[PDB]
């Protein structure tokens, strides 16, 4: 796999979003991967609905957190609407999928990346954006303004985001905290070192949609 990958430059990443005062990161994370795989497979970049996952994936806990892989299975075994059709509200409400007409996109499944394995994660990223988790509770992550983030942090993951590229010293992550945080809403997290968990536990639990 090459030294640089950046799905933004291939038109496979939509603008940075803001989950606001709702623990819906898991839904944002899943949607980034869906937006990515749809562009790669069909040539169209669309925005898909985090709100639908928030309201409809009842294995997850709405604004109290949830599971990217559970969200991704919903899209494959049910489907997902466009963001325009089912926009983000920042509060969990009833599932309105039926009320909003047929799905816009469907996936053919979900796969997990081999955990605690930097190359496996990079190989996956070279193929498509990947949902990843990390520890975000530390002030260092919260206050990140730019540069290669090395921590300090532990491995107690609590935040779902999406990896959309990498380069020699980093993995490039799209966060859902608005465009003021980090590097225009992104973070470059240090990679390469002697760390099987990854910086901030980045290699703990990573998924991607399958299509088509």
């Amino acid at each position: 796999i090459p030294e640089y990958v950046d799905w933004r430059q291939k038109g496979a990443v939509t603008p940075v979003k803001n989950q606001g005062s709702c623990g819906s990161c898991w839904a944002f994370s899943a949607v980034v991967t869906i937006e990515g795989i749809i562009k790669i497979r069909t040539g169209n970049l669309n925005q898909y609905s985090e709100q639908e996952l928030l309201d409809c994936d009842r294995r997850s806990y709405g604004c109290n957190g949830g599971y990217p892989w559970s969200a991704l299975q919903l899209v494959a075994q049910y489907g997902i609407h466009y963001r325009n059709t089912y926009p983000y509200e920042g509060v969990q409400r009833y599932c309105r999928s039926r009320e909003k007409g047929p799905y816009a996109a469907k996936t053919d499944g979900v796969r997990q990346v081999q955990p605690y394995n930097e190359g496996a994660l990079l190989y996956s990223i070279a193929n498509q954006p990947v949902s990843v988790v990390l520890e975000a509770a530390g002030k260092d992550f919260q206050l990140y303004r730019g540069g290669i983030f090395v921590g300090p942090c532990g491995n107690k993951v609590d935040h779902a985001v999406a990896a959309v590229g990498y380069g020699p010293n980093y993995i490039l992550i799209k966060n859902s905290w608005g465009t003021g945080w980090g590097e225009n809403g992104y973070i470059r997290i240090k990679r390469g070192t002697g760390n099987s968990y990854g910086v901030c536990g980045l290699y703990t639990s990573s998924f991607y949609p399958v299509k088509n």
């Binding site: 989950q19 005062s21 709702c22 990161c25 975000a136 779902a160």
Partner: peptide
């Protein structure tokens, strides 16, 4: 799994 800012 998974934070608000």
């Amino acid at each position: 799994g998974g934070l608000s800012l």
